[PDB]
Design a protein around this ligand. Structure first.
Ligand SMILES: Nc1ncnc2c1ncn2[C@@H]1O[C@H](COP(=O)(O)OP(=O)(O)O)[C@@H](O)[C@H]1O
Ligand SMILES: Nc1ncnc2c1ncn2[C@@H]1O[C@H](COP(=O)(O)OP(=O)(O)O)[C@@H](O)[C@H]1O
Ligand SMILES: Nc1ncnc2c1ncn2[C@@H]1O[C@H](COP(=O)(O)OP(=O)(O)O)[C@@H](O)[C@H]1O
Ligand SMILES: [Mg+2]
Ligand SMILES: [Mg+2]
Ligand SMILES: [Mg+2]
Lengths: 557, 557, 557
């Protein structure tokens, strides 16, 4: 009865975004078309509107996901469309989907059913070339580092201490660990290295936290690539790369204006994952939106223990933002998995499993409450959620003493979210927010890690491999102790162990390796077995993907 | 009717070699036993006998071989035993068999049937530890080069120009091309390198050309391992390795006294291949023998185009030796292959194929004639050679105007070689020898290569990959232009192409790569597709090899 | 001014070992000579003497070492000469020194000063070629594995699960992690691997545990080299290598007779280190010696936490030995270090530091107690040791209630060990032992690791990496949980952290990898950061090593 997401999105009727742009106080000459239905907005907009009030910032987070994902994006789009249908001047900010997973298992990040962002197949693929620009600035610097070595290694880099990897925006497990520079003296210096997925690039991180291009250029210059034989850092600015890198990012800095199925305006800009990067769209896109709309709905990657924590502690911190509300996306199907139902068994009514699994939602609620921001739960109704299940979960959130609304936006568009949209509005004028960060920058890297570990995931404490201890020692002694922490861990549990479902108790977080993002300005401790480059499944989506003589596309989702 | 070679050799009745040693003017205290049946002889022997006359030097060479090999060793042992049975004070000098091929396809190098050197399984395996000492001196230096790099690379070596490889005395194709030094800064410097088979080591080459240990130590020091960033050679003596290397060779320098099935004394010492190294036993062993015997029978590796040429042009040249006679080993089965008979078809009478194939023998004859040394052909009779075939070949050598004798030594021991033994003796007192080298040291590396290429193999000229041209340029400009040439090429043809049987005409030798043995004092141009490390077959001999509770050994050959 | 080890040892006055052997009732035809002064003794000696009575077994162990070593070997030899000088029929059993450390930092393992085993230079270099025999059996198995991958990978081995490594008897850090099999389809199958030092070989383990050559062979056949794609184990037996592996071991299996400076007989057989391997000489040498002497002195590598532990729990367990007494070697310098004094200062008087550092020795004393064997402390006097220092320690070991004797065997030979020899004799007359193992084979792998960590090292618990977890579970599931355990762990601490000196408290062991030795018959958990292939220092002893034209050796120590 509901057709495939690509059928829906190829049948969308879109407004010219030059219109939407003008319907928002954006001058004809601050728009740069990419066809009729996509544009980039000048940063002169936010500059000229510098001293004007902000609208209401709404974050959308979720519970602990299955591989299918639980509907933040779908919801965020839905919520925005619903608010438009109560006549509000609203905008949704989102992340650009990584190209890789569209050919893997997760698919794109445009939403679902009647809550989608269109032109969906442009959004999921090349979109407007932002990720490509990140990839080329990133890999440019890498080429220059390798050329430095070849051209007599003037700065005396120890090639075996180079942390700068390369990137490609595909799921390519064969490029995790590689030796390059082979073939003899004409062909470079042999060394061990590898690729991360482009969206996890520090270059993207910079895009996402910078305020303008000149700042991006300054940040690029601070990026640390390796170390000399006697341990002194070597930066991109030592290698004089920041100018070219910036040049390659000349258009990528400007955010992108698309729209929803119901013609509501949308910014898409930046796309770092939350398990392996900071999980928010650009600061640039959200500060702009907030000068142009009254309500700005925005998403953080994966669960509340990842994206929400990072949204609050890194992005909101660097931006000045004060979230007004937070929506917590929950599903019956996932809360059931969390209570012991097998993945292949999730479409079957199971009410006990929804009482048991609830622990998960409960901790996410408690954790958001910790930031001082009023929450609403949103029940994302799935095709096969039953009558009782949907009734029980509702009652558990009110019994839990927390705002809640059913959301039928997947199946019904914005009018699936009016209930939800009111409750959020109710929240805005009734419970003001009192946001504050989880931790002060002061603290040791190790104390900061322990605050997240215990306050958010609920472990007893934090294990450190000796490689981690050295790295941290090195980062504190060089004067980067102040930076905040972007944790890498599995999205599938509060723990660093992906098998531990629900609210797991009495465990340890094992920090394997610690990275320094001197340009983005944060520290990345890698926990558990998480990789910074994902792989493809037995049957990649790519095998079912196609296009025809008419431009009809199948298998994209 | 003839039992397996290992049955024969385990049933040998051996004299105590301390006896044989004394039966030769060797003092009780110049012998170092390794059991009753193997010893090492002091170099004080040759030193004290410095100014005493030499005996007659007899070389044993052959035609172009099949994979089975054509019987030089078997013959050399046979010839020696036959001469003993005409009451002569004779000794045979041979090469130590490489361990690797005993587990591969060729097997050992102790001889065959009733012409063998015993204790055969000691000779084929660890023998007296000479090859192990080469391997450890060689790999010691390699370890020190790698440690130099790790310890701050004081001499400024460009690790990508290191020519020093590692060695192991096995047929291990997986170690041809390897990257080592991986795992990060605590674990070395990544680089591309590999292993050659121990018997092809420059360290062995040195053993084989040195006169005493102090000379070996001096030669070790001249070995060139790599080059600095600005192209200056780096030597083992720069790295101060020659003392330890020499130390590891303290016993390996002394030659080994074993004996034949018929109790005739034997020296075994050094074992470089002839296709990929210089193909002679040590100078040390042959100069000693020649002070202790009246007739000294000695072997050069593979065909006359390889071993004989190198025996004359490198060893005899550096030693002073003047070969008195040369025996050319020929077989019907091989001359048949050379005339177009498939390998799986060689046990079947084929007289036309023996007239056609003869071209091969004819060129080897002409080539030896070129050195000014009187030749006898030896027909090594194989179990299935027919009556007519053996008759025809005889007549072709006399018709060819060249001395010839049937040799039944494989099946009958020394009394299979009396005919042969007389003809050689006939030769000694009737046709004096007038040996002289093929070329003067003066010449360019390139002229020297062309002399061998055209005079010996019969190609039109010599191709050079650009890598070869650079290397040669580098070796001439550093002042190693004078050194002689040890060619690497296939044993299976006069050409550098192994498929070209018989006397192939109008072809080119392609020199792929050129190596410098500054310690051994020669240049090694690698031609065709020949590797310096061989591989194992589909079913390695090793699968049929065993020993039992009694020490009965099967499958060694 | 005791002359350097090498001057003493070259100046030695030895007896032919043939005499030495007759005086133990070994027959002429059971001795196989390697010079006048080395032999290999037939396994027939032990066999024929099977039902005769065993002598007293005495273990020599030590406290936690400095890098230079605290004198176990120096003491084992001394003790043995000292016993002989008390008119006792006594034999020392030692391990063949690994070759690489002669060129490294540690040096050889022939003893020191006037307590050495001889001929030193041989004993430390190629000796009788046992290690080479190990090296070639191990590396032929590795060559056959790679060849199998090349010839169709018929057994379906997953090349990336291959645990079998290569070996070489050098300190080569560049061979730790390597990529082999490169160069294309003719040159093998690319894979990650590396080299361990030859003495840490499973082949070495088997030699050290086996009873005869047919036993060795059977052990070989059961060695697991890696796994199929679906997880089945693959053995040397499946590849039919055990036959050829045994051939190469035909002589390695027989133990070696040498002697001390004072001409006491000596067995030297098997070389395994105690940090990365099982750290005792062969059962063969020990059990044989127990038939020929009334007293058999024998050493375990590094400290009691490694060597003694393993001697007791795997050697004695498998051999049916019940050790009779145990010497703990201790020095002022090592104890001073343990009480905080920096290495560069261990020459200088500091009674206080020695008092605090006593903690180390105390724990080792306690630990030996848990085995049921009476102990004597041997205080091995160094030239730097002051009067009051040797007195304090003596008084401390007495107050601690331990039998103690000052030892001057380094400087005085066997007559400097009479007091020590006296105390040992005293212990054997009055105080029988009630030897018991530390754990049963019934226990699980983690049970047995936790006992050794807990009761011996004084660890609070053990941590496992995911990979360690998996390998343990793999081994239990496959039928090997029953095996005893040979921990790999730093020698420099009771902990797995090499800087935690004295008697570290409240620490945990971390197991990062678990090897299976299915043919030796034990399990090897690797802990902390310890590598199974060591490195060469800033300045190798190699650089200082030399031999002259007279055969006068310098630098070897
Ligand atoms: N209520 C729903 N019913 C069915 N499918 C849904 C629903 N909500 C989302 N989906 C689909 O499941 C996937 C997960 O939704 P998405 O918004 O991408 O979640 P998230 O952003 O949390 O990963 C997408 O394919 C989406 O189209
Ligand atoms: N006349 C013969 N009949 C049968 N087999 C022989 C004969 N001569 C040699 N062989 C065997 O064939 C192989 C080649 O002989 P060998 O002396 O090793 O030749 P080369 O030294 O030229 O390689 C050896 O296995 C040898 O025992
Ligand atoms: N009492 C001593 N005085 C001086 N040097 C010694 C003494 N005892 C041993 N040494 C030397 O110190 C090193 C370590 O002795 P060693 O017996 O090898 O101890 P271990 O066997 O425990 O390593 C050797 O070089 C040895 O000759
Ligand atoms: Mg999403
Ligand atoms: Mg031969
Ligand atoms: Mg020792």
């Amino acid at each position: 009865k509901v057709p495939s997401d690509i059928e829906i999105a190829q049948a969308a009727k879109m407004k010219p975004v030059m219109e939407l742009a003008r319907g928002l106080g954006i001058q004809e000459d601050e728009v740069e078309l990419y066809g009729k239905y996509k544009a980039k907005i000048s940063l002169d907009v936010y500059r000229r509107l510098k001293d004007k009030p902000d609208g209401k910032l709404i974050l959308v987070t979720a519970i602990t996901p299955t591989p299918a994902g639980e509907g933040k994006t779908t919801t965020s789009v839905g919520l925005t469309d619903a608010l438009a249908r109560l006549g509000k001047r609203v905008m949704v900010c989102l992340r650009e989907p990584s190209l890789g997973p569209s050919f893997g298992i997760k698919g794109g990040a445009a939403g679902g059913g009647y809550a989608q962002v269109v032109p969906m197949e442009d959004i999921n693929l090349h979109f407007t070339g932002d990720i490509h620009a990140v990839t080329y600035a990133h890999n440019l610097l890498a080429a220059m580092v390798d050329n430095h070595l070849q051209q007599g290694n003037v700065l005396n880099i120890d090639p075996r201490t180079i942390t700068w990897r390369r990137v490609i925006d595909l799921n390519d497990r064969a490029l995790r660990n590689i030796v390059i520079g082979l073939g003899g003296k004409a062909n470079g210096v042999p060394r061990e290295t590898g690729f991360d997925i482009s969206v996890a690039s520090e270059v993207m991180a910079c895009l996402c936290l910078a305020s303008d291009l000149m700042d991006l250029k300054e940040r690029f210059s601070r990026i640390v690539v390796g170390y000399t034989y006697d341990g002194k850092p070597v930066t991109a600015g030592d290698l004089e790369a920041q100018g070219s890198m910036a040049l390659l990012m000349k258009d990528a800095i400007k955010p992108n204006l698309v729209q929803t199925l119901e013609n509501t305006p949308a910014f898409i800009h930046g796309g770092p994952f939350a398990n392996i990067a900071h999980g928010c769209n650009s600061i640039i896109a959200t500060k702009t939106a907030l000068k142009l709309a009254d309500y700005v709905v925005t998403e953080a990657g994966f669960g509340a223990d990842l994206g929400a924590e990072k949204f609050y502690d890194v992005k909101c911190r660097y931006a000045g933002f004060k979230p007004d509300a937070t929506v917590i996306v929950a599903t019956v199907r996932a809360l059931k998995m969390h209570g012991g139902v097998p993945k292949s068994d999730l479409a079957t009514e199971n009410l006990e499993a929804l009482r048991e699994g609830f622990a998960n939602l409960e901790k996410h609620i408690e954790n958001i409450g910790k930031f001082g921001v009023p929450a609403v739960v949103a029940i994302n109704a799935f095709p096969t959620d039953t009558e009782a299940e949907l009734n029980l979960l509702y009652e558990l959130c009110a019994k839990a003493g927390a705002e809640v609304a059913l959301s039928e936006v997947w199946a019904k568009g914005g009018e699936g979210g009016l209930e939800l949209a009111r409750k959020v509005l109710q929240t805005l004028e009734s419970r003001p927010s009192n946001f504050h960060v989880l931790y002060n920058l002061d603290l040791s890297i190790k104390d900061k890690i322990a605050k997240i570990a215990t306050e958010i995931y609920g472990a007893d404490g934090v294990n450190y491999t000796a490689e981690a201890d050295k790295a941290i020692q090195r980062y504190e002694s060089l004067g980067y102790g102040n930076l905040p922490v972007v944790m890498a861990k599995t999205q599938y549990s509060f723990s660093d162990d992906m098998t531990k479902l629900g609210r797991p108790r009495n465990f340890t977080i094992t920090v394997r390796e610690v990275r320094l993002s001197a340009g983005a300005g944060f520290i990345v401790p890698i926990t558990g077995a998480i990789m910074t480059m994902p792989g493809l499944p037995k049957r990649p989506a790519a095998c079912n993907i196609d296009i025809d003589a008419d431009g009809v596309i199948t298998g994209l989702f």
